[PDB]
Amino acid sequence: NMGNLRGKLIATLMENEPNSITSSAVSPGETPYLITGSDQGVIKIWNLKEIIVGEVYSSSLTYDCSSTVTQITMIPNFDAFAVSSKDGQIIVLKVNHYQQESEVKFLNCECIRKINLKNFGKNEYAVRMRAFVNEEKSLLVALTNLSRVIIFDIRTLERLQIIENSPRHGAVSSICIDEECCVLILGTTRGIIDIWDIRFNVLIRSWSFGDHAPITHVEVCQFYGKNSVIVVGGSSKTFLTIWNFVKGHCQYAFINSDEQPSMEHFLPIEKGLEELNFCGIRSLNALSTISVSNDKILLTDEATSSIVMFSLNELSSSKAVISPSRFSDVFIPTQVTANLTMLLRKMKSLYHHDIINSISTCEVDETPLLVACDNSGLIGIFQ
Amino acid sequence: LRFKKLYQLIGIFHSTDLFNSDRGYIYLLRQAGESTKHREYVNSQLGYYLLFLHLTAIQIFKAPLPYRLMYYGSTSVIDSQYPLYFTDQMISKHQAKLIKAIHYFNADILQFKQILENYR
Amino acid sequence: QYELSLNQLDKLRKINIFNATFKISHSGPFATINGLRLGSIPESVVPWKEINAALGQLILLLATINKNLKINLVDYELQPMGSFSKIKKRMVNSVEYNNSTTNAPGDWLILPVYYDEETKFDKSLETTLEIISEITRQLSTIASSYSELPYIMNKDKINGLSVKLHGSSPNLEWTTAMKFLLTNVKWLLAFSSNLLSKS
Numbered sequence: 101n102m103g104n105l106r107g108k109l110i111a112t113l114m115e116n117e118p119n120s121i122t123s124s125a126v127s128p129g130e131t132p133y134l135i136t137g138s139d140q141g142v143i144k145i146w147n148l149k150e151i152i153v154g155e156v157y158s159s160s161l162t163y164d165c166s167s168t169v170t171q172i173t174m175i176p177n178f179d180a181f182a183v184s185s186k187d188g189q190i191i192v193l194k195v196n197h198y199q200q201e202s203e204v205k206f207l208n209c210e211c212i213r214k215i216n217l218k219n220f221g222k223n224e225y226a227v228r229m230r231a232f233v234n235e236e237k238s239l240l241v242a243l244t245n246l247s248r249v250i251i252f253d254i255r256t257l258e259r260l261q262i263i264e265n266s267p268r269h270g271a272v273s274s275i276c277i278d279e280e281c282c283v284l285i286l287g288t289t290r291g292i293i294d295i296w297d298i299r300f301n302v303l304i305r306s307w308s309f310g311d312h313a314p315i316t317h318v319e320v321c322q323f324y325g326k327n328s329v330i331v332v333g334g335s336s337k338t339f340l341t342i343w344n345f346v347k348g349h350c351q352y353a354f355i356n357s358d359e360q361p362s363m364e365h366f367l368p369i370e371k372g373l374e375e376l377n378f379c380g381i382r383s384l385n386a387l388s389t390i391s392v393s394n395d396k397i398l399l400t401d402e403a404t405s406s407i408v409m410f411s412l413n414e415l416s417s418s419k420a421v422i423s424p425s426r427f428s429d430v431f432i433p434t435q436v437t438a439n440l441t442m443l444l445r446k447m448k449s450l451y452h453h454d455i456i457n458s459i460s461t462c463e464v465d466e467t468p469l470l471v472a473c474d475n476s477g478l479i480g481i482f483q
Numbered sequence: 484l485r486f487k488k489l490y491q492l493i494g495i496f497h498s499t500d501l502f503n504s505d506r507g508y509i510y511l512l513r514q515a516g517e518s519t520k521h522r523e524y525v526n527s528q529l530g531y532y533l534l535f536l537h538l539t540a541i542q543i544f545k546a547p548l549p550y551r552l553m554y555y556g557s558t559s560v561i562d563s564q565y566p567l568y569f570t571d572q573m574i575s576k577h578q579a580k581l582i583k584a585i586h587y588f589n590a591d592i593l594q595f596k597q598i599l600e601n602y603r
Numbered sequence: 604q605y606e607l608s609l610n611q612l613d614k615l616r617k618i619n620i621f622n623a624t625f626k627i628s629h630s631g632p633f634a635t636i637n638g639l640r641l642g643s644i645p646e647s648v649v650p651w652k653e654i655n656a657a658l659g660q661l662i663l664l665l666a667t668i669n670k671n672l673k674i675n676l677v678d679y680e681l682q683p684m685g686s687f688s689k690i691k692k693r694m695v696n697s698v699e700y701n702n703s704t705t706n707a708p709g710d711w712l713i714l715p716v717y718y719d720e721e722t723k724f725d726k727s728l729e730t731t732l733e734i735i736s737e738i739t740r741q742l743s744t745i746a747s748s749y750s751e752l753p754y755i756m757n758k759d760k761i762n763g764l765s766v767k768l769h770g771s772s773p774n775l776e777w778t779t780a781m782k783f784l785l786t787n788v789k790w791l792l793a794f795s796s797n798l799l800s801k802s
Contacts (some may be wrong), residue, residue: 112547117602155549155589157596451547452607489618499670503684529685539624545614556639556656557686
């Protein structure tokens with residue numbers, strides 16, 4: 101668990117001032133390979149240890165996409181880095197590195213496979229991309245410009261199947277994969293939650309709750325298992341809503357407020373239909389980023405502009421990595437319902453940075469640490 | 484552009500603040516060990532007076548830096564756990580000053596990168 | 604981004620003070636310069652090298668003033684380095700010796716204002732006060748060119764306080780003396796800001 105550490109920021113580096121990175125990912129190992137994209141369609145790669153010791157701050161590797169990039173992800177148990185670009189360009193670059201003088205260095209970046217998303221015929225841009233490799237077989241999944249689920253086989257670089265969310269749900273609010281990866285978890289711009297079974301090729305269930313607003317993100321938590329999913333969205337005051345799929349209820353809801361919410365309002369919405377008119381929020385506290393691993397769920401708070409960390413083990417001991425100068429916040433949970441618990445956060449400046457468009461958790465093989473890329477095109481690291 | 488011109492005036496302020504440091508600049512360990520004797524131990528700490536100008540650049544830019552820095556002049560506090568200027572204090576103090584040298588070097592490179600990130 | 608802009612506006616309001624770097628404020632019983640505590644009381648004494656560094660910062664301020672105003676120093680020569688402050692005061696000797704021509708180049712007896720590395724620091728202090736008087740003189744000339752005497756000091760005693768170390772340990776005398784002297788130095792610094800603004 102890395103949540104116990106102080107987490108002071110030891111580095112600040114920005115290669116490209118001009119635009120924000122559309123994606124940020126890291127290649128795990130003994131010597132982590134840092135990677136971040138660009139809104140100008142540039143691929144940047146930095147060396148972990150090199151930035152840790154010598155503190156050299158520049159791009160260790162640079163690849164020209166020549167067109168704006170959409171997203172990126174590192175292939176599980178592999179050195180390959182997959183990336184999708186809003187030009188409708190899907191490609192994966194294989195890593196090439198060497199080890200000398202009791203250290204490591206990078207050689208060259210070249211795309212292994214090239215598949216045009218413009219070959220769909222409607223000229224759709226890739227929205228979000230998530231790839232996975234099972235010992236059985238390996239593949240990738242992506243969302244179209246019309247928010248359509250398409251799973252391309254990583255082996256043959258061809259489309260295995262094409263899934264389409266109902267237009268009554270608006271657009272796709274997120275992307276997530278099941279533990280067995282036989283099911284896809286996707287949110288809705290209409291403020292609905294939809295889990296679908298790719299096995300029988302249908303939509304398993306459609307859920308909604310809270311203020312019925314747009315869902316920020318959706319993912320499958322580790323400690324919560326495949327039987328429970330974590331979804332940021334829905335009710336305004338609620339920061340993160342975690343609900344068990346089978347149980348049909350929200351077990352733990354983390355909310356920022358000075359009071360406990362309504363039980364009737366927090367109850368699961370089912371009978372509701374597509375007739376609901378979309379109501380969102382234009383406030384600056386809406387858009388945010390979150391990354392969760394190893395029993396620790398980290399969430400960037402755009403409200404107070406600070407990095408927060410919620411430990412799934414104890415929400416009590418949970419706290420914010422970086423905060424304001426004057427004082428910090430005190431948080432603690434409770435339970436109104438036998439099947440549902442809720443965490444409360446009670447509130448009580450040299451660092452200057454814009455909103456965080458991307459964040460990634462990492463280990464230096466010595467001490468754990470976090471990296472972040474903001475909307476101003478600046479990156480930073482805290483150990 | 485305003486704060487840039489003010490940083491130019493502050494640059495002239497550093498030029499007028501240049502007495503002990505003229506021919507040299509911030510960019511060396513063996514150089515320190517070699518020049519330690521020839522500098523009479525005056526120009527050593529006087530060369531460590533650059534931490535004041537660095538701290539001046541810090542507070543002016545208001546940008547967070549990789550290494551914790553406090554400029555006491557002659558013997559300056561780095562991270563509060565390490566001295567900026569050894570001035571041939573001891574054998575282990577040379578090691579502490581070595582780690583501190585790596586520190587200040589890293590902060591110098593990072594700050595140089597931050598300056599290289601400058602754009603309109 | 605707009606928040607960063609406003610922060611830059613406040614940073615500009617602070618940037619109006621950019622002339623102040625080595626500037627001294629008052630903290631506790633004494634006054635510290637640019638975050639360097641000067642003077643020592645009967646309760647908590649400060650370090651010798653700390654006082655040396657502070658004096659080096661003061662000499663750096665004097666050198667910065669001499670560089671800024673571009674004024675010529677008649678009897679003085681400025682060589683601040685780190686904590687050690689070299690101040691060369693050219694003056695005549697006893698001149699009772701007939702064997703000494705003294706028609707050629709020479710130097711000061713003791714340059715250094717730094718100690719612990721009768722008291723030369725006392726002579727350097729009196730010479731510093733006289734240098735402040737001459738500073739107010741040339742500044743009065745600059746004022747007459749552009750067209751204010753709060754400091755009362757005597758070479759032996761400044762504002763009633765003892766400016767002489769006499770080789771003894773730190774006391775209330777040198778503490779209050781350093782106080783008044785640093786305050787007057789701050790006033791003269793403000794005057795230097797006014798002159799730099801008027802020129």
